[PDB]
PDB file of all heavy atoms in Angstrom:
ATOM      1  N   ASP D   1      15.972   3.362   3.647  1.00  0.00           N
ATOM      2  CA  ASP D   1      16.041   3.557   2.175  1.00  0.00           C
ATOM      3  C   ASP D   1      15.891   2.241   1.418  1.00  0.00           C
ATOM      4  O   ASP D   1      16.603   1.289   1.746  1.00  0.00           O
ATOM      5  CB  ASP D   1      17.406   4.110   1.759  1.00  0.00           C
ATOM      6  CG  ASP D   1      17.288   5.515   1.236  1.00  0.00           C
ATOM      7  OD1 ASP D   1      16.546   6.311   1.867  1.00  0.00           O
ATOM      8  OD2 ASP D   1      17.923   5.792   0.202  1.00  0.00           O
ATOM      9  N   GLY D   2      15.056   2.206   0.392  1.00  0.00           N
ATOM     10  CA  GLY D   2      14.849   0.973  -0.387  1.00  0.00           C
ATOM     11  C   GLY D   2      13.663   0.128   0.096  1.00  0.00           C
ATOM     12  O   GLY D   2      13.285  -0.855  -0.610  1.00  0.00           O
ATOM     13  N   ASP D   3      13.101   0.442   1.251  1.00  0.00           N
ATOM     14  CA  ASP D   3      11.974  -0.357   1.800  1.00  0.00           C
ATOM     15  C   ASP D   3      10.688  -0.077   0.991  1.00  0.00           C
ATOM     16  O   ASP D   3      10.453   1.065   0.480  1.00  0.00           O
ATOM     17  CB  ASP D   3      11.744  -0.049   3.285  1.00  0.00           C
ATOM     18  CG  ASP D   3      12.736  -0.644   4.282  1.00  0.00           C
ATOM     19  OD1 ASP D   3      13.635  -1.444   3.853  1.00  0.00           O
ATOM     20  OD2 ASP D   3      12.542  -0.385   5.504  1.00  0.00           O
ATOM     21  N   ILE D   4       9.814  -1.068   0.940  1.00  0.00           N
ATOM     22  CA  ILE D   4       8.365  -0.855   0.655  1.00  0.00           C
ATOM     23  C   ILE D   4       7.560  -1.083   1.959  1.00  0.00           C
ATOM     24  O   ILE D   4       7.934  -1.968   2.790  1.00  0.00           O
ATOM     25  CB  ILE D   4       7.895  -1.720  -0.525  1.00  0.00           C
ATOM     26  CG1 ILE D   4       7.895  -3.221  -0.187  1.00  0.00           C
ATOM     27  CG2 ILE D   4       8.723  -1.436  -1.774  1.00  0.00           C
ATOM     28  CD1 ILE D   4       7.534  -4.094  -1.341  1.00  0.00           C
ATOM     29  N   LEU D   5       6.524  -0.287   2.167  1.00  0.00           N
ATOM     30  CA  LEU D   5       5.714  -0.280   3.426  1.00  0.00           C
ATOM     31  C   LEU D   5       4.236  -0.334   3.070  1.00  0.00           C
ATOM     32  O   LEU D   5       3.790   0.507   2.300  1.00  0.00           O
ATOM     33  CB  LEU D   5       5.995   0.969   4.250  1.00  0.00           C
ATOM     34  CG  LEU D   5       4.995   1.211   5.397  1.00  0.00           C
ATOM     35  CD1 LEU D   5       5.109   0.166   6.492  1.00  0.00           C
ATOM     36  CD2 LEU D   5       5.128   2.591   5.968  1.00  0.00           C
ATOM     37  N   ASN D   6       3.503  -1.322   3.594  1.00  0.00           N
ATOM     38  CA  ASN D   6       2.040  -1.340   3.509  1.00  0.00           C
ATOM     39  C   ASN D   6       1.537  -0.768   4.846  1.00  0.00           C
ATOM     40  O   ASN D   6       1.984  -1.273   5.925  1.00  0.00           O
ATOM     41  CB  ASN D   6       1.449  -2.741   3.271  1.00  0.00           C
ATOM     42  CG  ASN D   6      -0.057  -2.710   3.267  1.00  0.00           C
ATOM     43  OD1 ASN D   6      -0.686  -2.664   4.343  1.00  0.00           O
ATOM     44  ND2 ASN D   6      -0.629  -2.643   2.060  1.00  0.00           N
ATOM     45  N   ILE D   7       0.698   0.271   4.804  1.00  0.00           N
ATOM     46  CA  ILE D   7      -0.096   0.700   5.992  1.00  0.00           C
ATOM     47  C   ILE D   7      -1.565   0.319   5.775  1.00  0.00           C
ATOM     48  O   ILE D   7      -2.173   0.713   4.761  1.00  0.00           O
ATOM     49  CB  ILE D   7       0.061   2.184   6.331  1.00  0.00           C
ATOM     50  CG1 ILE D   7       1.534   2.564   6.534  1.00  0.00           C
ATOM     51  CG2 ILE D   7      -0.781   2.478   7.580  1.00  0.00           C
ATOM     52  CD1 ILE D   7       1.775   3.999   6.843  1.00  0.00           C
ATOM     53  N   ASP D   8      -2.081  -0.511   6.676  1.00  0.00           N
ATOM     54  CA  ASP D   8      -3.455  -1.038   6.581  1.00  0.00           C
ATOM     55  C   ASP D   8      -4.235  -0.355   7.679  1.00  0.00           C
ATOM     56  O   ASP D   8      -3.801  -0.478   8.870  1.00  0.00           O
ATOM     57  CB  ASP D   8      -3.510  -2.534   6.763  1.00  0.00           C
ATOM     58  CG  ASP D   8      -4.878  -3.129   6.420  1.00  0.00           C
ATOM     59  OD1 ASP D   8      -5.882  -2.376   6.285  1.00  0.00           O
ATOM     60  OD2 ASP D   8      -4.920  -4.332   6.278  1.00  0.00           O
ATOM     61  N   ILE D   9      -5.310   0.314   7.286  1.00  0.00           N
ATOM     62  CA  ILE D   9      -6.170   1.134   8.182  1.00  0.00           C
ATOM     63  C   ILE D   9      -7.544   0.493   8.202  1.00  0.00           C
ATOM     64  O   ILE D   9      -8.116   0.232   7.094  1.00  0.00           O
ATOM     65  CB  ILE D   9      -6.289   2.600   7.711  1.00  0.00           C
ATOM     66  CG1 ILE D   9      -4.942   3.311   7.612  1.00  0.00           C
ATOM     67  CG2 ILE D   9      -7.256   3.373   8.608  1.00  0.00           C
ATOM     68  CD1 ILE D   9      -4.148   3.299   8.875  1.00  0.00           C
ATOM     69  N   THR D  10      -8.113   0.349   9.397  1.00  0.00           N
ATOM     70  CA  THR D  10      -9.535  -0.021   9.562  1.00  0.00           C
ATOM     71  C   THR D  10     -10.120   0.878  10.646  1.00  0.00           C
ATOM     72  O   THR D  10      -9.637   0.804  11.809  1.00  0.00           O
ATOM     73  CB  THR D  10      -9.767  -1.492   9.924  1.00  0.00           C
ATOM     74  OG1 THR D  10      -9.088  -2.320   8.985  1.00  0.00           O
ATOM     75  CG2 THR D  10     -11.246  -1.828   9.877  1.00  0.00           C
ATOM     76  N   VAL D  11     -11.062   1.712  10.234  1.00  0.00           N
ATOM     77  CA  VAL D  11     -11.735   2.763  11.049  1.00  0.00           C
ATOM     78  C   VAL D  11     -13.177   2.315  11.246  1.00  0.00           C
ATOM     79  O   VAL D  11     -13.788   1.759  10.279  1.00  0.00           O
ATOM     80  CB  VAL D  11     -11.593   4.133  10.348  1.00  0.00           C
ATOM     81  CG1 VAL D  11     -12.759   5.063  10.580  1.00  0.00           C
ATOM     82  CG2 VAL D  11     -10.289   4.807  10.751  1.00  0.00           C
ATOM     83  N   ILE D  12     -13.717   2.561  12.443  1.00  0.00           N
ATOM     84  CA  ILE D  12     -15.176   2.419  12.705  1.00  0.00           C
ATOM     85  C   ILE D  12     -15.704   3.804  13.038  1.00  0.00           C
ATOM     86  O   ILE D  12     -15.100   4.472  13.915  1.00  0.00           O
ATOM     87  CB  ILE D  12     -15.490   1.427  13.834  1.00  0.00           C
ATOM     88  CG1 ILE D  12     -14.863   0.060  13.581  1.00  0.00           C
ATOM     89  CG2 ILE D  12     -17.001   1.311  14.020  1.00  0.00           C
ATOM     90  CD1 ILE D  12     -15.032  -0.925  14.738  1.00  0.00           C
ATOM     91  N   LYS D  13     -16.759   4.212  12.345  1.00  0.00           N
ATOM     92  CA  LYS D  13     -17.433   5.509  12.593  1.00  0.00           C
ATOM     93  C   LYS D  13     -18.941   5.225  12.657  1.00  0.00           C
ATOM     94  O   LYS D  13     -19.521   4.789  11.644  1.00  0.00           O
ATOM     95  CB  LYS D  13     -17.032   6.538  11.539  1.00  0.00           C
ATOM     96  CG  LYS D  13     -17.691   7.892  11.721  1.00  0.00           C
ATOM     97  CD  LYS D  13     -17.211   8.637  12.947  1.00  0.00           C
ATOM     98  CE  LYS D  13     -17.696  10.070  12.918  1.00  0.00           C
ATOM     99  NZ  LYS D  13     -17.214  10.816  14.101  1.00  0.00           N
ATOM    100  N   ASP D  14     -19.549   5.504  13.806  1.00  0.00           N
ATOM    101  CA  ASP D  14     -20.995   5.270  14.069  1.00  0.00           C
ATOM    102  C   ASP D  14     -21.363   3.830  13.712  1.00  0.00           C
ATOM    103  O   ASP D  14     -22.427   3.630  13.121  1.00  0.00           O
ATOM    104  CB  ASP D  14     -21.840   6.306  13.332  1.00  0.00           C
ATOM    105  CG  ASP D  14     -21.536   7.720  13.790  1.00  0.00           C
ATOM    106  OD1 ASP D  14     -21.304   7.898  15.020  1.00  0.00           O
ATOM    107  OD2 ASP D  14     -21.485   8.631  12.925  1.00  0.00           O
ATOM    108  N   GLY D  15     -20.506   2.867  14.064  1.00  0.00           N
ATOM    109  CA  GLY D  15     -20.800   1.425  14.008  1.00  0.00           C
ATOM    110  C   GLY D  15     -20.527   0.809  12.645  1.00  0.00           C
ATOM    111  O   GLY D  15     -20.835  -0.369  12.495  1.00  0.00           O
ATOM    112  N   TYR D  16     -19.951   1.553  11.695  1.00  0.00           N
ATOM    113  CA  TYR D  16     -19.633   1.046  10.337  1.00  0.00           C
ATOM    114  C   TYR D  16     -18.113   1.147  10.070  1.00  0.00           C
ATOM    115  O   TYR D  16     -17.481   2.106  10.470  1.00  0.00           O
ATOM    116  CB  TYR D  16     -20.543   1.722   9.313  1.00  0.00           C
ATOM    117  CG  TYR D  16     -21.946   1.178   9.414  1.00  0.00           C
ATOM    118  CD1 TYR D  16     -22.851   1.678  10.348  1.00  0.00           C
ATOM    119  CD2 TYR D  16     -22.312   0.055   8.693  1.00  0.00           C
ATOM    120  CE1 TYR D  16     -24.111   1.117  10.495  1.00  0.00           C
ATOM    121  CE2 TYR D  16     -23.569  -0.510   8.816  1.00  0.00           C
ATOM    122  CZ  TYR D  16     -24.468   0.018   9.726  1.00  0.00           C
ATOM    123  OH  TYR D  16     -25.690  -0.576   9.850  1.00  0.00           O
ATOM    124  N   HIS D  17     -17.585   0.148   9.368  1.00  0.00           N
ATOM    125  CA  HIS D  17     -16.135  -0.069   9.075  1.00  0.00           C
ATOM    126  C   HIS D  17     -15.724   0.515   7.715  1.00  0.00           C
ATOM    127  O   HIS D  17     -16.467   0.321   6.750  1.00  0.00           O
ATOM    128  CB  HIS D  17     -15.808  -1.555   9.042  1.00  0.00           C
ATOM    129  CG  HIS D  17     -15.875  -2.232  10.374  1.00  0.00           C
ATOM    130  ND1 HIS D  17     -17.088  -2.567  10.993  1.00  0.00           N
ATOM    131  CD2 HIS D  17     -14.903  -2.561  11.244  1.00  0.00           C
ATOM    132  CE1 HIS D  17     -16.829  -3.117  12.172  1.00  0.00           C
ATOM    133  NE2 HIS D  17     -15.509  -3.111  12.348  1.00  0.00           N
ATOM    134  N   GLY D  18     -14.551   1.165   7.657  1.00  0.00           N
ATOM    135  CA  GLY D  18     -13.810   1.463   6.418  1.00  0.00           C
ATOM    136  C   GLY D  18     -12.442   0.790   6.454  1.00  0.00           C
ATOM    137  O   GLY D  18     -11.704   0.965   7.458  1.00  0.00           O
ATOM    138  N   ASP D  19     -12.133  -0.010   5.441  1.00  0.00           N
ATOM    139  CA  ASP D  19     -10.919  -0.870   5.410  1.00  0.00           C
ATOM    140  C   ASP D  19     -10.130  -0.596   4.135  1.00  0.00           C
ATOM    141  O   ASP D  19     -10.700  -0.724   3.038  1.00  0.00           O
ATOM    142  CB  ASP D  19     -11.326  -2.327   5.568  1.00  0.00           C
ATOM    143  CG  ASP D  19     -10.222  -3.290   5.970  1.00  0.00           C
ATOM    144  OD1 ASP D  19      -9.182  -2.835   6.422  1.00  0.00           O
ATOM    145  OD2 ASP D  19     -10.400  -4.483   5.779  1.00  0.00           O
ATOM    146  N   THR D  20      -8.854  -0.255   4.266  1.00  0.00           N
ATOM    147  CA  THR D  20      -8.015   0.095   3.103  1.00  0.00           C
ATOM    148  C   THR D  20      -6.535  -0.012   3.461  1.00  0.00           C
ATOM    149  O   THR D  20      -6.164   0.123   4.647  1.00  0.00           O
ATOM    150  CB  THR D  20      -8.446   1.488   2.627  1.00  0.00           C
ATOM    151  OG1 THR D  20      -7.812   1.763   1.384  1.00  0.00           O
ATOM    152  CG2 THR D  20      -8.129   2.563   3.633  1.00  0.00           C
ATOM    153  N   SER D  21      -5.699  -0.204   2.447  1.00  0.00           N
ATOM    154  CA  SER D  21      -4.238  -0.222   2.640  1.00  0.00           C
ATOM    155  C   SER D  21      -3.559   0.199   1.340  1.00  0.00           C
ATOM    156  O   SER D  21      -4.185   0.110   0.240  1.00  0.00           O
ATOM    157  CB  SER D  21      -3.751  -1.589   3.092  1.00  0.00           C
ATOM    158  OG  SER D  21      -3.718  -2.435   1.961  1.00  0.00           O
ATOM    159  N   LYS D  22      -2.342   0.706   1.487  1.00  0.00           N
ATOM    160  CA  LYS D  22      -1.551   1.156   0.336  1.00  0.00           C
ATOM    161  C   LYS D  22      -0.076   0.894   0.614  1.00  0.00           C
ATOM    162  O   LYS D  22       0.341   0.690   1.776  1.00  0.00           O
ATOM    163  CB  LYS D  22      -1.839   2.628   0.046  1.00  0.00           C
ATOM    164  CG  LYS D  22      -1.142   3.575   0.985  1.00  0.00           C
ATOM    165  CD  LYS D  22      -1.165   5.001   0.466  1.00  0.00           C
ATOM    166  CE  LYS D  22       0.098   5.327  -0.290  1.00  0.00           C
ATOM    167  NZ  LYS D  22       0.063   6.729  -0.745  1.00  0.00           N
ATOM    168  N   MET D  23       0.690   0.919  -0.465  1.00  0.00           N
ATOM    169  CA  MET D  23       2.147   0.791  -0.428  1.00  0.00           C
ATOM    170  C   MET D  23       2.768   2.191  -0.392  1.00  0.00           C
ATOM    171  O   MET D  23       2.291   3.119  -1.111  1.00  0.00           O
ATOM    172  CB  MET D  23       2.625  -0.010  -1.637  1.00  0.00           C
ATOM    173  CG  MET D  23       2.025  -1.392  -1.696  1.00  0.00           C
ATOM    174  SD  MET D  23       2.378  -2.419  -0.244  1.00  0.00           S
ATOM    175  CE  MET D  23       4.177  -2.498  -0.266  1.00  0.00           C
ATOM    176  N   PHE D  24       3.805   2.350   0.410  1.00  0.00           N
ATOM    177  CA  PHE D  24       4.709   3.521   0.328  1.00  0.00           C
ATOM    178  C   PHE D  24       6.095   3.059  -0.122  1.00  0.00           C
ATOM    179  O   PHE D  24       6.527   1.970   0.346  1.00  0.00           O
ATOM    180  CB  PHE D  24       4.783   4.202   1.686  1.00  0.00           C
ATOM    181  CG  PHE D  24       3.471   4.744   2.190  1.00  0.00           C
ATOM    182  CD1 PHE D  24       2.542   3.915   2.793  1.00  0.00           C
ATOM    183  CD2 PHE D  24       3.133   6.073   1.992  1.00  0.00           C
ATOM    184  CE1 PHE D  24       1.358   4.430   3.317  1.00  0.00           C
ATOM    185  CE2 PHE D  24       1.931   6.585   2.475  1.00  0.00           C
ATOM    186  CZ  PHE D  24       1.039   5.758   3.140  1.00  0.00           C
ATOM    187  N   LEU D  25       6.746   3.835  -1.013  1.00  0.00           N
ATOM    188  CA  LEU D  25       8.145   3.613  -1.479  1.00  0.00           C
ATOM    189  C   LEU D  25       9.094   4.486  -0.663  1.00  0.00           C
ATOM    190  O   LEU D  25       8.933   5.730  -0.693  1.00  0.00           O
ATOM    191  CB  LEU D  25       8.282   3.936  -2.974  1.00  0.00           C
ATOM    192  CG  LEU D  25       7.296   3.272  -3.927  1.00  0.00           C
ATOM    193  CD1 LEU D  25       7.526   3.749  -5.355  1.00  0.00           C
ATOM    194  CD2 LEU D  25       7.406   1.757  -3.855  1.00  0.00           C
ATOM    195  N   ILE D  26      10.033   3.886   0.065  1.00  0.00           N
ATOM    196  CA  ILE D  26      10.902   4.650   1.021  1.00  0.00           C
ATOM    197  C   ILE D  26      12.211   4.976   0.304  1.00  0.00           C
ATOM    198  O   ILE D  26      12.970   4.059   0.042  1.00  0.00           O
ATOM    199  CB  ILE D  26      11.175   3.908   2.337  1.00  0.00           C
ATOM    200  CG1 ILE D  26       9.909   3.288   2.944  1.00  0.00           C
ATOM    201  CG2 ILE D  26      11.904   4.811   3.316  1.00  0.00           C
ATOM    202  CD1 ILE D  26       8.804   4.248   3.203  1.00  0.00           C
ATOM    203  N   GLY D  27      12.424   6.253  -0.014  1.00  0.00           N
ATOM    204  CA  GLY D  27      13.626   6.744  -0.707  1.00  0.00           C
ATOM    205  C   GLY D  27      13.805   6.063  -2.044  1.00  0.00           C
ATOM    206  O   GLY D  27      12.810   5.952  -2.784  1.00  0.00           O
ATOM    207  N   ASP D  28      15.033   5.643  -2.348  1.00  0.00           N
ATOM    208  CA  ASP D  28      15.443   5.062  -3.655  1.00  0.00           C
ATOM    209  C   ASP D  28      15.108   3.563  -3.691  1.00  0.00           C
ATOM    210  O   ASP D  28      15.922   2.754  -3.234  1.00  0.00           O
ATOM    211  CB  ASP D  28      16.940   5.283  -3.876  1.00  0.00           C
ATOM    212  CG  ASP D  28      17.435   4.805  -5.228  1.00  0.00           C
ATOM    213  OD1 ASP D  28      16.661   4.899  -6.198  1.00  0.00           O
ATOM    214  OD2 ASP D  28      18.590   4.331  -5.300  1.00  0.00           O
ATOM    215  N   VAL D  29      13.962   3.193  -4.260  1.00  0.00           N
ATOM    216  CA  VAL D  29      13.490   1.775  -4.262  1.00  0.00           C
ATOM    217  C   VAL D  29      13.892   1.144  -5.603  1.00  0.00           C
ATOM    218  O   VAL D  29      13.827   1.832  -6.640  1.00  0.00           O
ATOM    219  CB  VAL D  29      11.972   1.729  -3.997  1.00  0.00           C
ATOM    220  CG1 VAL D  29      11.403   0.333  -4.121  1.00  0.00           C
ATOM    221  CG2 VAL D  29      11.656   2.317  -2.623  1.00  0.00           C
ATOM    222  N   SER D  30      14.274  -0.122  -5.596  1.00  0.00           N
ATOM    223  CA  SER D  30      14.731  -0.846  -6.806  1.00  0.00           C
ATOM    224  C   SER D  30      13.614  -0.905  -7.851  1.00  0.00           C
ATOM    225  O   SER D  30      12.422  -0.879  -7.483  1.00  0.00           O
ATOM    226  CB  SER D  30      15.189  -2.230  -6.462  1.00  0.00           C
ATOM    227  OG  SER D  30      14.076  -3.036  -6.112  1.00  0.00           O
ATOM    228  N   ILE D  31      13.981  -1.068  -9.122  1.00  0.00           N
ATOM    229  CA  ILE D  31      13.014  -1.335 -10.220  1.00  0.00           C
ATOM    230  C   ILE D  31      12.186  -2.574  -9.866  1.00  0.00           C
ATOM    231  O   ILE D  31      10.984  -2.609 -10.183  1.00  0.00           O
ATOM    232  CB  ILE D  31      13.752  -1.528 -11.567  1.00  0.00           C
ATOM    233  CG1 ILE D  31      14.498  -0.259 -11.994  1.00  0.00           C
ATOM    234  CG2 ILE D  31      12.791  -2.013 -12.632  1.00  0.00           C
ATOM    235  CD1 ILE D  31      13.610   0.886 -12.423  1.00  0.00           C
ATOM    236  N   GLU D  32      12.820  -3.611  -9.342  1.00  0.00           N
ATOM    237  CA  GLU D  32      12.110  -4.866  -8.985  1.00  0.00           C
ATOM    238  C   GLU D  32      10.923  -4.548  -8.063  1.00  0.00           C
ATOM    239  O   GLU D  32       9.800  -4.997  -8.330  1.00  0.00           O
ATOM    240  CB  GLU D  32      13.027  -5.809  -8.225  1.00  0.00           C
ATOM    241  CG  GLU D  32      13.567  -6.921  -9.077  1.00  0.00           C
ATOM    242  CD  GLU D  32      14.460  -7.862  -8.287  1.00  0.00           C
ATOM    243  OE1 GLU D  32      14.884  -7.474  -7.169  1.00  0.00           O
ATOM    244  OE2 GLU D  32      14.720  -8.983  -8.782  1.00  0.00           O
ATOM    245  N   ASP D  33      11.196  -3.767  -7.033  1.00  0.00           N
ATOM    246  CA  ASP D  33      10.254  -3.523  -5.914  1.00  0.00           C
ATOM    247  C   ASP D  33       9.163  -2.565  -6.403  1.00  0.00           C
ATOM    248  O   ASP D  33       8.011  -2.734  -6.016  1.00  0.00           O
ATOM    249  CB  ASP D  33      11.011  -3.035  -4.689  1.00  0.00           C
ATOM    250  CG  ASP D  33      11.921  -4.052  -4.002  1.00  0.00           C
ATOM    251  OD1 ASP D  33      11.869  -5.223  -4.327  1.00  0.00           O
ATOM    252  OD2 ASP D  33      12.709  -3.631  -3.179  1.00  0.00           O
ATOM    253  N   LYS D  34       9.511  -1.575  -7.225  1.00  0.00           N
ATOM    254  CA  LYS D  34       8.521  -0.663  -7.847  1.00  0.00           C
ATOM    255  C   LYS D  34       7.548  -1.468  -8.708  1.00  0.00           C
ATOM    256  O   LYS D  34       6.317  -1.218  -8.673  1.00  0.00           O
ATOM    257  CB  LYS D  34       9.231   0.407  -8.675  1.00  0.00           C
ATOM    258  CG  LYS D  34      10.040   1.413  -7.863  1.00  0.00           C
ATOM    259  CD  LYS D  34      10.814   2.360  -8.759  1.00  0.00           C
ATOM    260  CE  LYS D  34      11.186   3.671  -8.107  1.00  0.00           C
ATOM    261  NZ  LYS D  34      12.142   4.414  -8.971  1.00  0.00           N
ATOM    262  N   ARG D  35       8.083  -2.378  -9.501  1.00  0.00           N
ATOM    263  CA  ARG D  35       7.254  -3.236 -10.370  1.00  0.00           C
ATOM    264  C   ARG D  35       6.288  -4.044  -9.488  1.00  0.00           C
ATOM    265  O   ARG D  35       5.080  -4.107  -9.833  1.00  0.00           O
ATOM    266  CB  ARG D  35       8.118  -4.149 -11.239  1.00  0.00           C
ATOM    267  CG  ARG D  35       7.335  -5.265 -11.914  1.00  0.00           C
ATOM    268  CD  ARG D  35       7.465  -5.270 -13.422  1.00  0.00           C
ATOM    269  NE  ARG D  35       6.729  -4.147 -14.010  1.00  0.00           N
ATOM    270  CZ  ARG D  35       5.648  -4.252 -14.788  1.00  0.00           C
ATOM    271  NH1 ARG D  35       5.156  -5.439 -15.105  1.00  0.00           N
ATOM    272  NH2 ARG D  35       5.071  -3.156 -15.262  1.00  0.00           N
ATOM    273  N   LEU D  36       6.799  -4.661  -8.429  1.00  0.00           N
ATOM    274  CA  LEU D  36       5.947  -5.496  -7.542  1.00  0.00           C
ATOM    275  C   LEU D  36       4.753  -4.646  -7.039  1.00  0.00           C
ATOM    276  O   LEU D  36       3.619  -5.077  -7.132  1.00  0.00           O
ATOM    277  CB  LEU D  36       6.821  -6.033  -6.401  1.00  0.00           C
ATOM    278  CG  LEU D  36       6.029  -6.681  -5.278  1.00  0.00           C
ATOM    279  CD1 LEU D  36       5.368  -7.935  -5.782  1.00  0.00           C
ATOM    280  CD2 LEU D  36       6.894  -6.976  -4.063  1.00  0.00           C
ATOM    281  N   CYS D  37       5.013  -3.459  -6.502  1.00  0.00           N
ATOM    282  CA  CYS D  37       3.981  -2.554  -5.951  1.00  0.00           C
ATOM    283  C   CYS D  37       3.018  -2.122  -7.064  1.00  0.00           C
ATOM    284  O   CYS D  37       1.767  -2.067  -6.830  1.00  0.00           O
ATOM    285  CB  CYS D  37       4.626  -1.329  -5.336  1.00  0.00           C
ATOM    286  SG  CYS D  37       5.556  -1.667  -3.813  1.00  0.00           S
ATOM    287  N   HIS D  38       3.555  -1.827  -8.240  1.00  0.00           N
ATOM    288  CA  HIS D  38       2.745  -1.309  -9.373  1.00  0.00           C
ATOM    289  C   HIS D  38       1.844  -2.438  -9.879  1.00  0.00           C
ATOM    290  O   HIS D  38       0.673  -2.219 -10.055  1.00  0.00           O
ATOM    291  CB  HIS D  38       3.655  -0.691 -10.431  1.00  0.00           C
ATOM    292  CG  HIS D  38       2.908  -0.211 -11.629  1.00  0.00           C
ATOM    293  ND1 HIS D  38       1.961   0.781 -11.554  1.00  0.00           N
ATOM    294  CD2 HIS D  38       2.954  -0.591 -12.921  1.00  0.00           C
ATOM    295  CE1 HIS D  38       1.428   0.982 -12.735  1.00  0.00           C
ATOM    296  NE2 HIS D  38       2.019   0.149 -13.592  1.00  0.00           N
ATOM    297  N   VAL D  39       2.372  -3.636 -10.060  1.00  0.00           N
ATOM    298  CA  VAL D  39       1.564  -4.770 -10.571  1.00  0.00           C
ATOM    299  C   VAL D  39       0.508  -5.144  -9.523  1.00  0.00           C
ATOM    300  O   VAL D  39      -0.632  -5.490  -9.922  1.00  0.00           O
ATOM    301  CB  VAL D  39       2.449  -5.961 -10.992  1.00  0.00           C
ATOM    302  CG1 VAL D  39       1.626  -7.210 -11.292  1.00  0.00           C
ATOM    303  CG2 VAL D  39       3.276  -5.587 -12.220  1.00  0.00           C
ATOM    304  N   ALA D  40       0.831  -5.097  -8.242  1.00  0.00           N
ATOM    305  CA  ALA D  40      -0.175  -5.381  -7.187  1.00  0.00           C
ATOM    306  C   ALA D  40      -1.346  -4.381  -7.294  1.00  0.00           C
ATOM    307  O   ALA D  40      -2.520  -4.794  -7.175  1.00  0.00           O
ATOM    308  CB  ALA D  40       0.467  -5.363  -5.838  1.00  0.00           C
ATOM    309  N   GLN D  41      -1.082  -3.105  -7.549  1.00  0.00           N
ATOM    310  CA  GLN D  41      -2.177  -2.101  -7.659  1.00  0.00           C
ATOM    311  C   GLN D  41      -2.942  -2.338  -8.976  1.00  0.00           C
ATOM    312  O   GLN D  41      -4.174  -2.211  -8.949  1.00  0.00           O
ATOM    313  CB  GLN D  41      -1.653  -0.662  -7.500  1.00  0.00           C
ATOM    314  CG  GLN D  41      -2.736   0.399  -7.643  1.00  0.00           C
ATOM    315  CD  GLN D  41      -2.192   1.788  -7.433  1.00  0.00           C
ATOM    316  OE1 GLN D  41      -1.280   2.206  -8.132  1.00  0.00           O
ATOM    317  NE2 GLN D  41      -2.634   2.432  -6.359  1.00  0.00           N
ATOM    318  N   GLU D  42      -2.272  -2.665 -10.092  1.00  0.00           N
ATOM    319  CA  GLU D  42      -2.961  -3.055 -11.360  1.00  0.00           C
ATOM    320  C   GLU D  42      -3.932  -4.220 -11.102  1.00  0.00           C
ATOM    321  O   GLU D  42      -5.007  -4.233 -11.711  1.00  0.00           O
ATOM    322  CB  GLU D  42      -1.960  -3.438 -12.464  1.00  0.00           C
ATOM    323  CG  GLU D  42      -1.196  -2.248 -13.043  1.00  0.00           C
ATOM    324  CD  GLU D  42      -0.141  -2.671 -14.068  1.00  0.00           C
ATOM    325  OE1 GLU D  42       0.297  -3.834 -14.036  1.00  0.00           O
ATOM    326  OE2 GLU D  42       0.234  -1.830 -14.902  1.00  0.00           O
ATOM    327  N   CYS D  43      -3.559  -5.188 -10.267  1.00  0.00           N
ATOM    328  CA  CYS D  43      -4.415  -6.350  -9.898  1.00  0.00           C
ATOM    329  C   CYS D  43      -5.740  -5.865  -9.284  1.00  0.00           C
ATOM    330  O   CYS D  43      -6.812  -6.283  -9.764  1.00  0.00           O
ATOM    331  CB  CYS D  43      -3.663  -7.281  -8.949  1.00  0.00           C
ATOM    332  SG  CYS D  43      -2.465  -8.335  -9.816  1.00  0.00           S
ATOM    333  N   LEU D  44      -5.661  -4.897  -8.380  1.00  0.00           N
ATOM    334  CA  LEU D  44      -6.829  -4.349  -7.646  1.00  0.00           C
ATOM    335  C   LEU D  44      -7.686  -3.566  -8.641  1.00  0.00           C
ATOM    336  O   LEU D  44      -8.898  -3.794  -8.671  1.00  0.00           O
ATOM    337  CB  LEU D  44      -6.314  -3.468  -6.506  1.00  0.00           C
ATOM    338  CG  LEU D  44      -7.373  -2.664  -5.738  1.00  0.00           C
ATOM    339  CD1 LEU D  44      -8.495  -3.543  -5.226  1.00  0.00           C
ATOM    340  CD2 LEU D  44      -6.749  -1.892  -4.579  1.00  0.00           C
TER     341      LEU D  44
END
């Protein structure tokens, strides 16, 4: 509870790469940590 988690995926299909990652919010996450994840996605 309270963790943030990045899962980074890189798949190869017929010799070509797809690369992506996202944040997950685990249960009751602090305002601080929600802001960090939200501002990081606004950056992208």
Side-chain angles (χ1 to χ4, degrees):
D1 247 43
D3 285 355
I4 68 184
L5 167 68
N6 177 281
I7 304 179
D8 190 346
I9 302 304
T10 307
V11 148
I12 305 174
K13 180 69 169 181
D14 299 322
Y16 287 84
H17 290 76
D19 198 16
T20 189
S21 78
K22 78 166 265 182
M23 301 301 300
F24 298 81
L25 308 177
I26 314 303
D28 184 34
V29 174
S30 71
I31 297 290
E32 258 181 344
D33 291 350
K34 292 175 157 170
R35 167 123 288 246
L36 169 67
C37 291
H38 177 62
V39 170
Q41 178 178 58
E42 288 176 338
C43 282
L44 172 53

